[PDB]
Design a protein around this ligand. Structure first.
Ligand SMILES: CCCCCCCCCC[N+](C)(C)[O-]
Ligand SMILES: CCCCCCCCCC[N+](C)(C)[O-]
Ligand SMILES: C[N+](C)(C)CCO
Ligand SMILES: C[N+](C)(C)CCO
Ligand SMILES: C[N+](C)(C)CCO
Ligand SMILES: C[N+](C)(C)CCO
Ligand SMILES: C[N+](C)(C)CCO
Lengths: 127, 127
């Protein structure tokens, strides 16, 4: 009624989330009742789009839900850890059919045309 | 001690282990006070070298201690998971100097001469 508690609330046209004492969360994560994780920056505003928390990138949809799995941002694929959420970079992510792998460049972007180089001991270098 | 209670035992040549309850260990793992993981087959014999436990491969030093990381067996390189100790297969383990990767074949052997096929979308197939 007069004391928002553990809930979302759109104040002044901005989404915030109040703890059990009526304070807005700030620089904190909150797993909502819908199953999604949400993040609120220093001003307490619900994160939308890309945000870098504790030196790891995460992608939230327009509704504020942190996404996981493959997503396409500006027509270029990315991969967010299926469990933790963070953007995977410089890694090979197994395809769904388990047939192959996809390589995400050092900057998280997918390599549609990866170039490999092999050294006599087998060390594979990608580019 | 009038009866062995939880400890090793070098019965002439071979080592064995009895639980606190007195009984001997067989077909059971045991993380000791040395941090090292140990295993004893159905005849309580302390594993040494290579062993296929529950359909997975592991390697212990000449002292029953389970080791992890790269290990060689007859001109062939294998990688042992640093957490489970199990043999990794059809996986890319990153080099220690971060410059590149080593691909292990499904059969668990290192691919020193890997061959790659990059599909239109960027899918990568390894041989
Ligand atoms: C419901 C909030 C409980 C706070 C603990 C948040 C721990 C960080 C884990 C969240 N996450 C995996 C998405 O990064
Ligand atoms: C009793 C209310 C049940 C809570 C459901 C609240 C709707 C989800 C919040 C929408 N959102 C902040 C994510 O945009
Ligand atoms: C580097 N990122 C792609 C994560 C930021 C886009 O604004
Ligand atoms: C796979 N190798 C054994 C060649 C690399 C460890 O140095
Ligand atoms: C042979 N032992 C395993 C008992 C010695 C290792 O410290
Ligand atoms: C397979 N082990 C039990 C040895 C690993 C536990 O982390
Ligand atoms: C699996 N993906 C759809 C992300 C790759 C095709 O570009």
């Amino acid at each position: 009624g007069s004391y928002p508690k553990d809930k979302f609330e759109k104040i002044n046209g901005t989404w915030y989330y109040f703890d059990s004492s009526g304070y807005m969360l700030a620089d904190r994560w909150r797993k909502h009742t819908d199953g999604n994780w949400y993040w609120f920056d220093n001003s307490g505003e619900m994160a939308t789009g890309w945000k870098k928390i504790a030196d790891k990138w995460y992608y939230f949809n327009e509704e504020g839900a942190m996404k996981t799995g493959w997503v396409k941002y500006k027509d270029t694929w990315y991969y967010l850890d299926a469990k933790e959420g963070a953007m995977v970079s410089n890694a090979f992510i197994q395809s769904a059919d388990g047939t192959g792998w996809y390589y995400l460049k050092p900057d998280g972007t997918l390599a549609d045309r990866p170039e490999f180089t092999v050294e006599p001991d087998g060390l594979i270098t990608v580019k």
